[PDB]
Amino acid sequence: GFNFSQILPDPSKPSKRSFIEDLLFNKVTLADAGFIKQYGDCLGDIAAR
């Protein structure tokens, strides 16, 4: 009778994240990003500020 559906992963996503885990991912916003392969970027563009 216990229902662990919201904390176990679901296969429909392309990751093994559950319903609480991607709620937790979309609340930690970043003051600066990490790596988006921004090295092709920042060269020759105008949106490099």
Binding site: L43, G44, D45, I46
Partner: protein, 49 residues
């Protein structure tokens, strides 16, 4: 006590567009490759766009 003749020069440096310049011949304008440059005494190295 013999008289001396004095000239005093005075100028700003790298503030605004310039009028008095130096005896140097220009070149063309190459883009999108790492070159040195010289814009009115301002040196540097990089890529123009």
């Amino acid at each position: 006590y013999q008289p001396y003749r004095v000239v005093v020069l005075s100028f700003e440096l790298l503030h605004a567009p310039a009028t008095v310049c130096g005896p140097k011949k220009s070149t063309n304008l190459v883009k999108n490759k790492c070159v040195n440059f010289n814009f009115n005494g301002l040196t540097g190295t990089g890529v123009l766009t």
